[PDB]
Symmetry: C3
Subunit: 333 residues, 3 copies
């Protein structure tokens, strides 16, 4: 009787931050209550000022990271305000049945719905909007996030020993397909219906115009760089709802990686780069050993440095000259 | 002395169905005899009526799934009737030597050949035509299938316990490269030789025009949807002879997945999505827990919903409201 | 005190060959000294005579394979002669800190530098140039190689038993983006600065014009085919610094594969094809069982046979008719 279970309300935070949670479950199974409000909004996604009509969960690209434990129940109140124009829904890859919930959550502007599902499998998973007949358009407009279902006894390494992170970040990577004219300039549109065919044409090229973290070129840089201290253990959850990516921490590694995101599997050790398939969330655990600036990228380096799939860590602490040193600094022959 | 071994003749069936076999070998090693007849034929591959000159094994795209046990011998009689126009052959990724058999099986129209190889490694494997100098053209014309080499004691989970499927399906995923004119319309051709350069140009874009299951958009839908019952254990073998794919069961999971298809490895558990590299077969085992319609896709959702890489399951049985329920159906604020 | 450790100077060799080393470390930890000289040079990369301005480490595409043991120190003297025109550096994915060394190794023409780092993680790893603001341009001009960090007790299988190779080869796979005019012909350029915008435009298509092994179409064929004998154990290290690849030995397998290249993980067994993500090195171990010509490809077969990603083995020895035989050679119905 689910009515006999504790309810806990989560208050979500904007990526790349993650709402408060316990790695090791401090209670029995719970109904974990989430509310998200769909927001269609204009977003500037690059340095040139290219502006798209984004389709978001809770105002952000990606949508926020939801965190529960295995065999909790996720109960999501999904709100589509009458300020929006389109029908939306939600598919949880973590859930079982009804297209991940998409068949049960169709909300027109001015409607809401509440979905409950049992989180029976531990892992990080994509969630995304998926309205029948317009699925890739919603997804590639930004309407996707992730949910982490932690094992009730937290994470474990390949030998069954605990892995405990000190910090977690959620990197949502988004492929956009901004329609171009024959000369190669981006087109803009009066209404979503006038945009639709050109959106479909642009998607069918299979060539993103932009690939970004946290919704825009440079979003995880400067005053919004990710941070860590030397010696800190950091989990980076990374999702891509529509296209493969190959994350890499420039100057570091994935000490333990679940490339396809499912924690009943032993992690891959010592990864330089790992493949997260489109439609998947993955997670990488790293203990920082050196201070300084790191870049965290999709290691198709064109996708990283030309199309936007690059963020930064700023890491504080002492430099270890045993691990790396400039023996002879650049100088002239 | 191979002549002292039992011979068993297999009678193949059209994908996505799979010929009768035993998971656990009920005999010792056998010479397992297959016959396939090459058929060049016109195929309509989309809803618009786009018609290509397909190159098939046994009349289908994909070619049929062949099933043997580890250390059986596969003996294939490959027939190229004089109604065909081209030279063909066959490369088995399951086989060792002579380019997988391709160097020994070159048949002109009006010829046949018989190849035997020992299936020394368990797994699902691609087979495909591969004539020297025209390899991708044959493959991306549909001339590929798969062979499953089961361990003699059937499949096992990550702990060494048996996994037994109740039903198996074979999903062959095909990238086609239909040549386009400058305006973007598909071109058609009088002869394969007149088609060849434009086929090569279209392939060199690396952008498929179509990505389909079982040879056509919507082939595994409607009256040809895949079926299952709640509680049934289903293995879905999935091949892609030329390009990566990322299968996903919408509303389900891969409970146990061999993403790169080789059963001596422990399966990955609880996958949302998995990457099958181009040139590979993979296999996913799932026990259905909910009735209703599922979609089975390549989770590049553009590839799925715009280019064709989507099929359906229809699943019969009782709905489990513990696992998922609509708490409050969509309604107006 | 690193000054108390043995120093050993390595003399590199041109890919696909690999400098002399011991699988099992015959000494304690060492400072292993390497020198590489950057060479910008023209290279003809295809049969048509297409000539690019390559950016190399030590004159080759890929750069040479460097081999050390876990917890050795790599000390690289990197020389940028004043005959070059550009700034370069080096990022080792094997290293920890300072963007893999890239932040500490910026050398203008006429400068050199010496970097030392501790090789704390065993595996094969990419190294590549990565100058801030021009990273993909350098990488996709050929300026990448790999380093193998062997476990001090050599390689092990999935059960912890030794795997010892008799021969090793290094296959560097390079995606080039030669700018094209509207008609589709390659453009050429007076200076790297005049080339830059068109290089960036060509990269942003995400469609390589060429994908080659060892720097050119057909480089690992003919008198430069890879060789082996029946019964020989061969490790093929394969890198791709910028784009996914899916290696396949036509007629063989990867008996043991580290697809993402890190030897603390058990290898995947019996692979037909494996995915090496862009920004990764992987390694496949195979014992040849049949003589003859093999092709070793990226199993996107368009990428292999049309764009260049194909090499050959010539294997000497006896043919095993148990493993494969032509029962009835091609002949007429
Ligand atoms: O190591 N990242 O380019
Ligand atoms: O969950 N498939 O979109
Ligand atoms: O088996 N390679 O096409
Ligand atoms: Cu939506
Ligand atoms: Cu999905
Ligand atoms: Cu053929
Ligand atoms: Cu093949
Ligand atoms: Cu450089
Ligand atoms: Cu890198």
């Amino acid at each position: 009787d689910i009515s006999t279970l504790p309810r806990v309300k989560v208050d979500l935070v904007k990526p790349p931050f993650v709402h408060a949670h316990d790695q090791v479950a401090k209670t029995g199974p719970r109904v974990v209550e989430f509310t998200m409000t769909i927001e269609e909004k204009k977003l500037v996604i690059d340095r040139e000022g290219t502006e798209i009509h984004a389709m978001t969960f809770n105002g952000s690209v990606p949508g926020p990271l939801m965190v529960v434990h295995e065999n909790d129940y996720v109960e999501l109140r999904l709100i589509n305000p009458d300020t929006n124009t389109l029908l939306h829904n939600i598919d949880f890859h973590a859930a079982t049945g009804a297209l991940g919930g998409g068949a049960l959550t169709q909300v027109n502007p001015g409607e809401e719905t509440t979905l409950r599902f049992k989180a029976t499998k531990p892992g990080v998973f994509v969630y995304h909007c998926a309205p029948e007949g317009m699925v890739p358009w919603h997804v590639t407009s930004g309407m996707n996030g992730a949910i982490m279902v932690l094992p009730r006894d937290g994470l474990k390494d390949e030998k069954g020993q605990p892995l405990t992170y000190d910090k977690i970040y959620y990197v949502g990577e988004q492929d956009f397909y901004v329609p171009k004219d024959e000369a190669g300039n981006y087109k803009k549109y009066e209404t979503p219906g006038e945009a639709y065919e050109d959106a479909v044409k642009a998607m069918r090229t299979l060539t993103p115009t932009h690939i970004v973290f946290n919704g825009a070129v440079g979003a995880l840089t400067g005053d919004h760089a990710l941070t860590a201290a030397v010696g800190e253990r950091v989990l980076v959850v990374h999702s891509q709802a529509n296209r493969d990516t190959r994350p890499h921490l420039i100057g570091g590694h994935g000490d333990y990686v679940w490339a396809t995101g499912k924690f009943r599997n032993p992690p891959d050790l010592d990864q330089e780069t790992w493949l997260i398939p489109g439609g998947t969330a993955g997670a990488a655990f790293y203990t920082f050993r050196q201070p300084g600036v790191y870049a965290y990228v999709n290691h198709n380096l064109i996708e990283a440095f030309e199309l936007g799939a690059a963020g930064h860590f700023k890491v504080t602490g002492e430099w270890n000259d045993d691990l790396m040193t400039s023996v002879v600094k650049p100088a002239s022959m």
